[PDB]
């Protein structure tokens with residue numbers, strides 16, 4: 001039941017959201033990063049300074065070596081390993097066990113994060129972007145093929161963990177309307193942004209710029225990442241709105257903290273960002289609104305805990321727009337693979353203060369009939 005699946009995610013700020021999984025027979029328990037931005041299932045399989053535990057293939061009598069190596073370079077972080085298959089379950093997910101491809105990570109560089117409490121990654125996107133190539137069936141494809149669980153999952157990520165509901169939509173997790181944007185191509189979860197506003201002010205760019213060279217929904221990525229030209233415009237606009245206070249250059253590069261005395265964070269001086277997503281109907285769109293409570297990410301370090309400190313969680317990208325965790329937080333996001341669309345609604349843990357609230361609103365109509373896809 002979906003009720004059993006609620007609150008099955010945990011996480012630390014800036015360190016992803018993970019779900020408990022078991023691999024092998026007898027089951028070995030691991031925490032696994034939920035990542036809609038990749039398509040490989042991979043687990044630590046040898047000692048590493050940042051690993052609390054790892055997958056021991058020799059103790060699983062159901063493990064099969066595929067006799068193939070694999071290497072995955074992310075934007076930040078990389079690992080290499082050996083491919084195999086084994087039995088996998090999700091204790092607080094569907095009540096099924098399936099045989100899936102698993103990469104056993106034997107060497108890595110800046111992949112594992114000290115203290116994150118996860119030991120592997122679950123790539124939930126499509127085979128087209130799997131390594132070594134698209135012939136390696138991703139986990140979710142295996143799950144659907146072997147169990148006839150409906151071809152859909154949803155994520156409710158909550159900020160300072162959340163729920164991954166497999167096989168359907170849990171209405172207890174959102175309010176208001178669920179708005180759908182088409183998946184443009186089944187590789188990443190690619191979507192189209194048709195308009196961007198900062199505090200109600202249109203950035204006024206050709207809408208193709210927002211999607212150079214793609215826009216994706218990516219739960220494994222912390223920040224909102226924007227194409228260079230869009231990032232520069234966004235920062236200028238956010239700077240203009242918050243000009244009553246000055247921040248270090250390092251802050252806007254996402255590197256340095258800004259801190260305020262406990263409870264005094266001036267949320268009002270920071271603008272709301274509206275991302276308008278292509279709708280299911282021609283030239284219609286809906287917007288999701290992003291508050292500073294989302295794009296100023298709280299740090300949870302005990303050493304900094306006397307005050308409220310934040311990192312600027314918007315970053316420049318060279319590989320397109322990435323709608324990462326800080327964007328997904330507070331929304332219920334439905335990955336409706338069966339109907340090739342992604343849904344957004346305000347979730348039960350949506351961000352708000354007395355003046356403003358995260359929202360999903362539509363429909364909006366645009367006069368210009370240009371296709372915003374970069375292609």
Ligand SMILES: CCOC[C@@H](Oc1cc(C[C@@H]2CS(=O)(=O)C[C@H](NCc3cccc(C(C)(C)C)c3)[C@H]2O)cc(F)c1N)C(F)(F)F
Nearest residue numbers: 014015016037038073074075076077110111129220221222
């Ligand atoms: C930097 C730490 O952030 C915290 C971050 O940790 C990681 C998260 C990921 C998943 C990545 C994060 S990313 O920023 O690299 C974008 C990428 N999705 C798009 C993409 C870009 C490039 C290549 C590919 C492939 C896999 C299709 C080849 C896919 C995701 O999957 C890999 C890592 F190693 C680490 N640690 C977390 F903790 F999860 F929040």
